[PDB]
Amino acid sequence: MIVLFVDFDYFYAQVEEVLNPSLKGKPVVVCVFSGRFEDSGAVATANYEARKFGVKAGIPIVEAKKILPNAVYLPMRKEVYQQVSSRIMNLLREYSEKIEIASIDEAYLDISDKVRDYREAYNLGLEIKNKILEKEKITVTVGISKNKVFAKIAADMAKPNGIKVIDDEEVKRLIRELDIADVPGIGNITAEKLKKLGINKLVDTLSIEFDKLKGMIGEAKAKYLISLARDEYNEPIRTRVRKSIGRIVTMKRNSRNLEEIKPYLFRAIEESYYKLDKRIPKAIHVVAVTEDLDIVSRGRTFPHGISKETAYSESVKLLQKILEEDERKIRRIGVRFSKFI
DNA sequence: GGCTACAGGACTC
DNA sequence: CAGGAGTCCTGTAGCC
Numbered sequence A: 001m002i003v004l005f006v007d008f009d010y011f012y013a014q015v016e017e018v019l020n021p022s023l024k025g026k027p028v029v030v031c032v033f034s035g036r037f038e039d040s041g042a043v044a045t046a047n048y049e050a051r052k053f054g055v056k057a058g059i060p061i062v063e064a065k066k067i068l069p070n071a072v073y074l075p076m077r078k079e080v081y082q083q084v085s086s087r088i089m090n091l092l093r094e095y096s097e098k099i100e101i102a103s104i105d106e107a108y109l110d111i112s113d114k115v116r117d118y119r120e121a122y123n124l125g126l127e128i129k130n131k132i133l134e135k136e137k138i139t140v141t142v143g144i145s146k147n148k149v150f151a152k153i154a155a156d157m158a159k160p161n162g163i164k165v166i167d168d169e170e171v172k173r174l175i176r177e178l179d180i181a182d183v184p185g186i187g188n189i190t191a192e193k194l195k196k197l198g199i200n201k202l203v204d205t206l207s208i209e210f211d212k213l214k215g216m217i218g219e220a221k222a223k224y225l226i227s228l229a230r231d232e233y234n235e236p237i238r239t240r241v242r243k244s245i246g247r248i249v250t251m252k253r254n255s256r257n258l259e260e261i262k263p264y265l266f267r268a269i270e271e272s273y274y275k276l277d278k279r280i281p282k283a284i285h286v287v288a289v290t291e292d293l294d295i296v297s298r299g300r301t302f303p304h305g306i307s308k309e310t311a312y313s314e315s316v317k318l319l320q321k322i323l324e325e326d327e328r329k330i331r332r333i334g335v336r337f338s339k340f341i
Numbered sequence B: 001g002g003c004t005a006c007a008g009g010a011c012t013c
Numbered sequence C: 001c002a003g004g005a006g007t008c009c010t011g012t013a014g015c016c
């Protein structure tokens, strides 16, 4: 199989640049203002200008400002980025029916039947990079390999504004050399408990007792890593269908007071229903982020669709449930709908 | 034993 | 100083 992965560069930031070219060349920081106090919130993402100085996704906005006080701080305008995204996804579909839109920012294309080899695949990569630049002036990075995991690693190595092919030999080389931390799906926690078994590379999973790998990191995860080490990994490119829709908001104040939280919970429901469009969920979950950043939740599945009214009442019951079974204070409250009809 | 629901865990962008 | 949205897996407990 031949997979061609497309990853838009500093997507949110670049879209802002396309809409306002004077930004070009400056450090741009796209932010999620929380509402609690001046500059409370976090960085959603930033361009390379800002990034090369340590301003990265997830850090607090005030910390970003300490590092880059004169950078441009823009509020997230997701709907805008989503519309530009949708248009680019449509361009990619001209290249293949077997397409997987993994996020607002990435897409996997199976071009096995469009191209004969990696040479023709690389060339198809330039063709795509060019198309997107012509139509939307967005630069992207193209990763190419025999499966989704290595096509993504390929792009991770070539961004930004790049294109890279990882043929069969480098796959073998990477299995040996590549820091297993850089493997998609392995975060700090997993990587810590991995690399602490001397497993620092994909190969190391082959020589360790299985019940043991699986003891530290779970079955699915160990099979995944091993199948990759054996160069026997295969996951087809697939149309993705959204399985949940939700909304979570940050309260001005942390609270444990039911009447004080309801307003937030209710607004989160309204926004959620809106996004459901015509989907009818059978399940609802009330999600709360506590005082200390711990996530708690209580849900319920119904044998029928959930009307907005039923969502309102059930959410309060679920919220009460949380309040009763957890003495902590809530800082963020929301809901998530799933199991659509 | 294994399938279901539910709640938490970990990860990705 | 700690936003937001969405996905997959696992441990536990009911049940067949």
Ligand SMILES: Nc1ccn([C@@H]2CS[C@H](COP(=O)(O)OP(=O)(O)NP(=O)(O)O)O2)c(=O)n1
Binding pocket: A007, A008, A009, A010, A011, A012, A043, A044, A045, A046, A057, A058, A103, A104, A105, A159, A160, B013
């Ligand atoms: N922690 C994070 C990470 C990403 N984001 C959002 C979700 S999608 C948008 C992608 O922006 P981005 O900077 O282009 O992400 P990348 O790491 O792919 N940058 P790139 O090198 O272009 O692929 O960032 C976020 O809100 N919070």
Ligand SMILES: [Ca+2]
Binding pocket: A007, A008, A105, A106, B013
């Ligand atoms: Ca990405």
Ligand SMILES: [Ca+2]
Binding pocket: A007, A008, A009, A010, A011, A105
């Ligand atoms: Ca990107």
Ligand SMILES: [Ca+2]
Binding pocket: none
């Ligand atoms: Ca063509």
Ligand SMILES: [Ca+2]
Binding pocket: A181, A182, A183, A186, A187, A188, A191
């Ligand atoms: Ca990692």
